[PDB]
Design a protein that fits this description.
globular, mainly beta, binds copper (II) ion, Jelly Rolls, Peptidylglycine alpha-amidating monooxygenase, five-stranded antiparallel sheet
Length: 304
């Protein structure tokens, strides 16, 4: 359980990093705790594997981000305060009773160097815990496999977030549409995660190419928000449009909710050939709203 060393070298090029809560005593149900772990190398390195070290009963949710400024410098903190004060580049999400996302063979996230993130920030959410267990420190976390051997495919995140959108009170279905033109080298989408708050019914993401929608994925965002795998990975390519839709319900809500708060985020996890690769992309617009008249019917079907 509690108390390998922080850094464990493996061959010339490889090392393991144990990212572990420093003996925390979670009081209270659904409390999100955070710790940072600086990268031991200044040079470019590649995260090529992950291994959860989650306590069985206590832990329901773990996230790992890549970023440059962690919100606290303390040995741990509460992620209510924040994760990183800058852009938090998400790398790994784990839920209990969830298919954990596993990097395809030659894929790694690019960290360190001038570009890449310097810190990992770990986020561990605990269940109901409860009972008469205050005499218990927890060291939950995850081990990361890093190497300085350059990888031929580089993983990254395409984040789609809604910003315009107002949820009127009482309307049973409200749609939040997001769309950008893709204008880079090809990316290959292998997983997705969806974030909303209370009112999300379902989030869906698509590549649209010559007016044909291909599914990237869809999920009820009230399920655990891990990275779900893509059945067959989707190449997204120059002149494709990425388009997302969230269905909210303002049933019972007392007044207008904006995006008292709500979010629609789609995390699209991809790989790109190392030379043309980018670690991060974003859409926060709906350039092609007219298009959504076309959207497959399956995108408005609830996932209860
Ligand atoms: Cu949120």
């Amino acid at each position: 359980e509690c108390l390998i060393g922080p850094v464990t070298p493996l061959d010339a090029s490889d090392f393991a990093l144990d990212i572990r809560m420093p003996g925390v005593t979670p009081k209270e149900s659904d409390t999100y705790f955070c710790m940072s772990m600086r990268l031991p190398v200044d040079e470019e390195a590649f995260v090529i594997d992950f291994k959860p070290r989650a306590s069985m009963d206590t832990v329901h949710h773990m996230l790992l981000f890549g970023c440059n400024m962690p919100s606290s410098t303390g040995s741990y903190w509460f992620c209510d305060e924040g994760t990183c004060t800058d852009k938090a580049n998400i790398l790994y999400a784990w839920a209990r009773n969830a298919p954990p996302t596993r990097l395809p063979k030659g894929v790694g996230f690019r960290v360190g160097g001038e570009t890449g993130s310097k810190y990992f920030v770990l986020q561990v959410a605990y269940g109901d815990i409860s009972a008469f267990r205050d005499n218990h420190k927890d060291c939950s976390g995850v081990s990361v496999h890093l190497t300085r051997v350059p990888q031929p495919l580089i993983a990254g995140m395409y984040l789609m977030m809604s910003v315009d959108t107002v949820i009127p009170p009482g309307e049973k279905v409200v749609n939040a549409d997001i769309s950008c033109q893709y204008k880079m080298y090809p990316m290959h989408v292998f997983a997705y995660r969806v974030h909303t708050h209370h009112l999300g019914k379902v989030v869906s993401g698509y590549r649209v190419r010559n007016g044909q929608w291909t599914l990237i994925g869809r999920q009820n965002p009230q399920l655990p928000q891990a990275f779900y795998p893509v059945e067959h990975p989707v190449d997204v390519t120059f002149g494709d449009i990425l388009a997302a839709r969230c269905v909210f319900t303002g049933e019972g809500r007392t007044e207008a909710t904006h995006i008292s708060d709500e979010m629609c985020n789609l995390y699209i996890m991809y790989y790109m050939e190392a030379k043309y690769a980018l670690s991060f992309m974003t859409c926060t617009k709906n350039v092609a709203p007219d298009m959504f008249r076309t959207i497959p019917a399956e995108a408005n079907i609830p996932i209860p």
